[PDB]
Amino acid sequence: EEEIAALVIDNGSGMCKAGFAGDDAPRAVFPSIVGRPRHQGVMVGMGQKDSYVGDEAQSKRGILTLKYPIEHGIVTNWDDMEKIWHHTFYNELRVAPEEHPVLLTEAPLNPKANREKMTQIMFETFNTPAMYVAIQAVLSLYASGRTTGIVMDSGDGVTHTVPIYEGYALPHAILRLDLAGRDLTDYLMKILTERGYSFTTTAEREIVRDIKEKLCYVALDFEQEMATAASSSSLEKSYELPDGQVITIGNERFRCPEALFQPSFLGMESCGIHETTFNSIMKCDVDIRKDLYANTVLSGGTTMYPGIADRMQKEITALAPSTMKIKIIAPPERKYSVWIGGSILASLSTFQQMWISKQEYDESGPSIVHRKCF
């Protein structure tokens, strides 16, 4: 075949988004979880299967304890990650990685060890001709088809912010904020408890993740919505648990995402996301700011909440000079923006020379990741 295709994998914590480069959507997207049988089984002709990976784990949740191998964009446990990748290639895609160059995503400002060790695995686990490790934000910017913008990247892992102008990139200006979907989830299960509902275990932690993925939304003004919580009508929603129990969540709903804008709720000093965006833009040269204000791109799973764009717009506009208009461009399909970006990058002809080649690695070692790529 010509070009051999190429493989693309986005692993921020939470989800693996994988598929062939050269396609508009990934084939396989499943949770990055390694569940292990915590309870000793007593039958015969079970499994045994030491552990389960991917949406298999979601299916068989109750038995397993689930461990997310990636936290804050850092891989805690490598064998687990390897297992997840194994599952992606063999269980879903059904590819021999020897037959494809593979692109990995990775978060900014992230420890060297992850990049280096990541590459070490790809070469000395799944024998592969070539690979590349790329910054998440840039990829989403490509996916949006814009050359310039400040990409607000918040996955389940961590939140990141990379201003870009006319390609280029500003290292000093790049900002990385420790908040995530996962931290919102931890907050949310906390806030439920004041209602009586107690979710103590990893299994049901994912149930609240599911709740947040739909029920929660961001206030266009927090205090107003909280005021109107007095007369509860629309702000309460019934949710059905798999157990059959019913949950009813009022104001607690929208204050969950509020945390992004008020990390004091979580107890961290680190400024809210909008202020971090200012922190990034303000670090940039005076000249370019005009378009960064106007070209803010949101990406990642934890920007999905309804109404986030609007709130960011209102806050940024409030803070900034009203001399210039602040457009925020947040597409739907943002969740997959990183992966799409990866697809487009591996599809690019010129890119086909920038790969880290197996050969190059074998001569020069794992450390070469930083040398060559950003």
Binding site: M43, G45, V95, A96
Partner: protein
Amino acid sequence: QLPIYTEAIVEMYRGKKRHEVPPHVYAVTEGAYRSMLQDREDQSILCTGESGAGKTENTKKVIQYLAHVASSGELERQLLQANPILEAFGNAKTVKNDNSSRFGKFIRINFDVAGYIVGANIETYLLEKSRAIRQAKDECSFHIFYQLLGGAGEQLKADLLLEPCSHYRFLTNGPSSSPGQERELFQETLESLRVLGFSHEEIISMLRMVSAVLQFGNIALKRERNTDQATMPDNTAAQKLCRLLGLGVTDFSRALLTPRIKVGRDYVQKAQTKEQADFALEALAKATYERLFRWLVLRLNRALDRSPRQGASFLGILDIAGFEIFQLNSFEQLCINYTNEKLQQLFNHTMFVLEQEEYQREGIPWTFLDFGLDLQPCIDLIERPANPPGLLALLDEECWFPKATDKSFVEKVAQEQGGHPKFQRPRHLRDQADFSVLHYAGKVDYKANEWLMKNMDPLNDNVAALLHQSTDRLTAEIWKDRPRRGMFRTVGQLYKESLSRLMATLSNTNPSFVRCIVPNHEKRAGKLEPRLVLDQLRCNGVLEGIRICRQGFPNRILFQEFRQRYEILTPNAIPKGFMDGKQACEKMIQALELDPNLYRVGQSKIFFRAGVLAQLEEERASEQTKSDYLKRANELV
């Protein structure tokens, strides 16, 4: 058709060793007959599956020899007549061949101590009964089914209430025409039965149950909302069944759906799933067919007449399908392979004892491993029930355990038994087949799909009992029945048992071996397709036989021959002629510089490795080149 098989040739063969004459069947069967009168022990002739080859036709020639030798009313000419019967019931149109024997045929020719024919009987060990229920993607079930369908007129069809192929669930892949016009063949087969002396009544009864097996398909069990048990809302089909047998519809309906079981001494019902009852239906189909087949063989042997019985000994002739390989290779393929494994092992053992005794006859003591052992780990891989459990055993375990999938099966066998060297998981990209083993023939790939379903043969004792009570003579007489009988009972298990019976029977006797190959698809001579012959050499074990004898000292030459023939080799070593012919060889081997590993000194012969005589022969052509040169030069100058 070759001029061979005259009287002069056969007379010519008599009382001689195999080497003494040219290769022929008459020779090997002479070996068997002579070994019997000589050794007074029973003999067996193994023919390995090949078409369609006319293996039987050849075997008629063997019988012809047998008749002429043993004397003192023609031969059993009805043996020719038997072929279409067993062919019709037993064989099916498959990818390898349009006619292939699923069942093994064991033909016993009974001999008194005098060496005369007391009579003969047929025995049929292995059957694939699962073929009737279930089939390959592009193949046909047994011939009789199709030839019944097209062949029977309204006269018979109206009694049997046969329908076209599309009507039956149990018939896969539709009609799958196949004709051949058919119908004519069926007509031939009826006469073939009749001459044998079965009554028209009996034939109609037989054909009725052959419908009955097919009818088991028309019954539909419908799962019920909420309850497990399921049921049969449509009485029509099973009503038809009940007409076709002695069964009362109601009796049968309760029995099948909710059977009663003896929990001593007081009976209790059972709840059965839709799946379970379906398997029971398929079971009774399959077991019914098997029973039918058995009865045919016994009733046939009654149609064969014997003189004064029980005297004294027999010669078995085994016709069974050989080691099979397809692209896909399903479950039945595995069972066939398993049997061919054991047969092959017997051959190795036989060869082993032959060589070990040959060494003593030549006075060479040598110890070497049993050749049979080569196959043994592969056999244990498939068979061994216990410590590590076998593929069949593990399949059975999968089948019974609650929610069993095919995938859980393969995973389980990998986990349980992957450390086995003959077992290979392909892994990674396809590799369409999900696991593979390494036989004597080579590496074969197996697809695990629907193996659990094929394996299940649970049998209701209640319905069985009803059959035992049938009104009609035929079926009731058939069901005239220890193991795990009832539920459990798996096809793999039964098959294994049946093979064990056969291996015991063959093992009791002294076997002899014939290997049949077809040159081509053409059905014409003068064309040998090397690839096809290679394939056949793989599946008949002949390659294994060569790789066996290589391990020993295959080439055996007498002292006298070795000296007279090869003397040209070493003028130096060979003395002035002390003679006695031992000393000659001593000298020759000595100066020719050969490893003592590579030969032995025997009484009448020297045993040689492979390639030793190749070197010596090269020294004879080199020596001959030297001598041709010296001669020609001397004459010239």
